[PDB]
Amino acid sequence: AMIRQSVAAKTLLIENEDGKGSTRMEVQDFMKRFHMHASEDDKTGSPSTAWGTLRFPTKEATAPYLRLSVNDDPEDALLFVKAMLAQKYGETYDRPSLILSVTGGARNFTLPPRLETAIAKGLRLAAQRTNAWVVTGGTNTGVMKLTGQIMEALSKTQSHFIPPTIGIATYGVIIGGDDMTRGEPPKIGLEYEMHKKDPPKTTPLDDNHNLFLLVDDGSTNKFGKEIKFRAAFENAAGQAFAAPVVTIVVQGGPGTLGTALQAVRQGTPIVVVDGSGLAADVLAYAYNFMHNPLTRFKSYTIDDLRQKVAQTFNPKSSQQLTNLLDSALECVQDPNLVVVYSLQESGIDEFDDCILKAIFSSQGKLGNKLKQAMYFDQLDVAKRALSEASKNGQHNEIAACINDNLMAAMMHNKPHFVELYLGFDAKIYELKPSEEVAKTNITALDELPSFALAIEELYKREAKKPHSHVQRLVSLSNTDVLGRHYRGRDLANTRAYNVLRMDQIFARLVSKDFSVNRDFTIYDSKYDKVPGIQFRRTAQASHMLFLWAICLDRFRMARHFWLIGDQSIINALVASRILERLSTHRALQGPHLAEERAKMQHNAKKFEELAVGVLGECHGSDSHMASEMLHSKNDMFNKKNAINIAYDAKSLAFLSHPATQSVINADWYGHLKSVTSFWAVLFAFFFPFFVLPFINGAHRLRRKFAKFYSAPYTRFISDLLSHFVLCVVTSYFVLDKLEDTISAIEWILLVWFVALLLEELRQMIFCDGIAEYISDTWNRLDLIMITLFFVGFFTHASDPSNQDSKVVSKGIHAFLVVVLWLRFMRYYALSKNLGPKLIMMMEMMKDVSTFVFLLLIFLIGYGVAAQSLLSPDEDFSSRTFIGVLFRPYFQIYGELFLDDLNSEANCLGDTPFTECSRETVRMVPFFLAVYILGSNVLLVNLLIAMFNDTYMKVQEAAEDLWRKQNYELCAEYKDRPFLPAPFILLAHVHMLFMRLLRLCGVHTQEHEKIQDDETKRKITTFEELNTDKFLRRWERERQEMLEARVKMTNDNVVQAMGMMDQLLEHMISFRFSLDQQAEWYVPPEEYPKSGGVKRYLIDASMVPLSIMCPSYDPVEYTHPSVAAQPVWADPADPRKIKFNVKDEVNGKVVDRTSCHPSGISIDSNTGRPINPWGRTGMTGRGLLGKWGVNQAADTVVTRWKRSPDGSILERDGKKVLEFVAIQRQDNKMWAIPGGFVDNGEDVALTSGREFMEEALGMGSAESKDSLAALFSSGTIVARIYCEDPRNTDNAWVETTCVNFHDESGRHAARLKLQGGDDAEHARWMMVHGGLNLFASHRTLLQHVTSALNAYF
């Protein structure tokens, strides 16, 4: 399967530069911006005709390829990739939150299975969770092939969106480039032949990569010519999708080291996979040596690294090895930007956590790190970051980013993060939308708060996804912008997912008269001082999101918002109804939605269970308080109590519960005592003054009197008694003879049936709809009993003295009495014994109909046959038909008319069917014998069997249906007037008088009673406490099941085996461990800052002043900066100046004495000083400002390198130092801070001033006191000669070194290092012997570490 057709694309959606939407443009128009080079000689190039899709063997999908020039814009390539994704997966494609650049070895290599599996699993998890763009080299060898193999399982095991695998490769090495170039673009499904013999090129593309950018420069069979574009694309993609770029380094050669060096220099973090060998092992060794505080790394040395580098890369020259070592040490200088993953240290499936660790150390703002922590589903990491931010005084940034972080957590359906963000003092009703809503002319829309617009954004964002049920539900709803059912356009579409309209849609989903009441006026700032307002604001906000979470069927988030708010049961019933109706709605039908549909139905059942469970818990704890809770009217749903809600939600399970039934029975009896049976209420009803006071003052006796007759049970009793007299009086009237005029009893019955007709009309028009009224069968029976009487009365009243009219009137009134007595069975439904039995009967009527259809066959067959057999010579008449129907129907009830049959057959014998006139009539008994065998033996007994089966089947459902009808009857007799049927006319004239006085007169109103806030908060507190108690009991109960215990035992064993696997791994490591347990300086030729002026070159064996060297001819060159004569520069003529002693220039002493034992010798010919430290191939002062000894002061502010835990880092058994070093502006090499000693100052002042100027720049309070305390203890450790490249034979640098050591490290930690003046960057760097530092500063720190017994 899965091969239908292939059709070429003609138009593409290219995203605009604003980043807001995609515009449709022609493929050749968009694709014009890419160029190709026909040859190496060519520079301008020609427009690219090489783009399309490549089809690779054993791969179902095709991978797009585009050949683009080196001069092409990386933004255009990014647009091409974006356009492809937009074309394939629609406009709303999953944007990448991570760019994973995979670098390493070009040649093939084998990794250990555990490490490869861990790396593959972690990379697959990271890529699938963040929708990451993986950028590799694209060739079918090494780390690119490994990455392709890793991403292949992700492309196979997952449906819909597949994360792109972009391969950026040099076109000049790719097999099949000529085939790809030739043709008319685009080449749809072009076959790629990796085994085809391309002569010059030998590198094929990897078949598992999803896209391909072939960078062309016209060269052939040269590698490495795309690296800069690749870096530029990754940076461009990173800026466009606001995503960090994370490089992953697996194995690798020397160019991978240079690539990694470039990556950290550009701020991009790297993840080094330790244990993969080669350059990765070198990088891992270097970091672990420089940063890791564990005990097993304390034996790490540079000598062993150098040995490792020499044994691994095998350089041709020593300088290459030194440069490689220097580059490797330069990569791991910043500990945050390199994260090393190792199999023997880190755990299995923790590779995505490392990637996340690199991400945290990469992005500086708090919000981006939390968003990324959400994507990888690492709550603990987010919790630790939040706790650390809370402890370190970063509380303001937390509040600034929580809203967006909380919003992001809700869109991606992560409640656990929702709980985290909400726990750190983030108010739920303070959400803010990402975009700004435009102003609307409607006042209802303008009244809406900020959070409402945030939900509107969640609805819009979820709705824009393909084949979303939300869009179909809103479109099918056929409502306007405010949700009213009325069915300009721009306003109706841009804010089509506002919360009011959604509230209206959910209201119609519940029932026909459900209307949720919102009050957004409480969110204004003027009501903040009112007590308890927060809870209300919380509860309302929670409710609105709760409804949103019900719509998207996110059960866990729904349960969380349901728990946060109040009115738990009603909300669970409403939720159950909305899901259940939504699960069978027209908007959710479709082939792809099946699992979704199933999930909603499941969730509906769960919510129903919750509503029952919480109710049960309440009734278990306090029955009276549970009754008070069920009777409470809630303002949000039009003052409807929980039972009204339950009936509207059609929750049979809730209504059949004993707590609910107790409340309904209490409502029936009207909360009075000593009123349970029929006889008690009947006795109290007939004798009001003798039983009521003695049951449990004027306002007591009067209250009890007003309470008893307002009870619905009392109105039933009045209605029964009224209907019973009606039956008795009408029965007497039909039995007694009619008089010659209209009698008095007839007039009484006329008045009584008009009163019943007026009540039926009042119920029909002024109490319910006509459809609702006719639906009920008892209302239909009522209409028949009224029509039959009036037909009967008018038949008699038309001619009262006519005998025939009286006879016809009694004939109609016979049915009237039959219906009346049948209607009297309506009042049996209130009884717990008679009521279900009545519903079962109505169920058994179908079986009665089945029996009637089967008997009808035998009755008409036997009847026609028997009647014909008895009378074979009679003309057909009506009597023949009566003979067919009469006897056969009664013979089934045991009345057999055998004597009558014998008389009709004209058989004169003593034996019944002997000596007859015709022999055929003797067959009359035989037919009947068969007939009564068919009817009484077979059919009646079959009916008994069917009724037995039917009862057992529908008894429980009938009982539940009776419990719903109990409320229905209670609700019906609550609003019905007290006065019975003949007197109801008085009640009717009273209601008409009240309606006339209210509508026209307007002299009155309605009064009611509202429950106090104390009792309201008591009900709220009780309901919340029992909700929590039920959830605790429910969780413990589901954990004590057998299936759960077996599953928990299984997971516990596996995890025990995992720990055992780790234990053996450590043993195998121990087995291995136990098994193995048994100097003249010559300056450079070109003088610095001289504009290319070169010295006179000399060999290193001619450096000593003791050696003669007669061919020494130095060049006299002086720099323009020194020749311009600044304040700190000595005069150009060095005559009359005294050396080897402290000399005064402008009355200030300068250090003109050198520490060299021979001293400075003065040339007699020119007066210039002669350098005692050797020849430099240059006379004159050069770039140095002072003749002879230029006194410099260097400041080495040092501290012990400590881990966070507080332990001192220890290498080679000695403690390791760390000093502030600045990177020089002129030659971009790191160096010790320092400068020339100023006039009138000592090394103490010079050292302090230089340290403040370079490392600190502009500099307080406590930090100034710490710096002064640190600067109060300085020791002059050395006064040596500098090996500075600006030194000449007449001007040389001599340094005094001042060391400021921070033993505790408290004072050093307050310094904000930032490069200024003649320094580019300043940082704390560790002192060691492998440092590639400026001049002879390695000797100076060596002296510092020698003096302070520190590592070197």
Ligand SMILES: CC(C)CCC[C@@H](C)[C@H]1CC[C@H]2[C@@H]3CC=C4C[C@@H](O)CC[C@]4(C)[C@H]3CC[C@]12C
């Ligand atoms: C829905 C049910 C209740 C309908 C009942 C219809 C009743 C009221 C009507 C329908 C047909 C009527 C019968 C039609 C004709 C006659 C013949 C006349 O010489 C005497 C009355 C008699 C016998 C009528 C009695 C009343 C009657 C049975």
Ligand SMILES: CC(C)CCC[C@@H](C)[C@H]1CC[C@H]2[C@@H]3CC=C4C[C@@H](O)CC[C@]4(C)[C@H]3CC[C@]12C
């Ligand atoms: C398989 C079933 C339907 C077979 C039915 C057989 C019927 C058609 C036959 C079988 C025997 C027949 C009867 C045999 C003899 C007599 C006596 C004669 O003076 C009158 C007719 C009468 C009484 C016959 C009536 C028709 C009869 C009942």
Ligand SMILES: CC(C)CCC[C@@H](C)[C@H]1CC[C@H]2[C@@H]3CC=C4C[C@@H](O)CC[C@]4(C)[C@H]3CC[C@]12C
């Ligand atoms: C229908 C199948 C199952 C059985 C058929 C049996 C019928 C054909 C038999 C059973 C008993 C029989 C009757 C028994 C006796 C007599 C008396 C004789 O002087 C005339 C025929 C007459 C009246 C028979 C007519 C046929 C009869 C009705």
Ligand SMILES: CC(C)CCC[C@@H](C)[C@H]1CC[C@H]2[C@@H]3CC=C4C[C@@H](O)CC[C@]4(C)[C@H]3CC[C@]12C
């Ligand atoms: C166990 C049950 C099924 C026993 C069956 C009894 C049958 C065989 C008996 C019961 C009544 C009998 C009938 C009674 C009377 C007459 C009238 C006579 O002039 C001819 C035989 C005839 C028509 C009989 C035929 C056989 C009969 C139908």
Ligand SMILES: [Mg+2]
């Ligand atoms: Mg709650």
Ligand SMILES: [Mg+2]
């Ligand atoms: Mg009625």
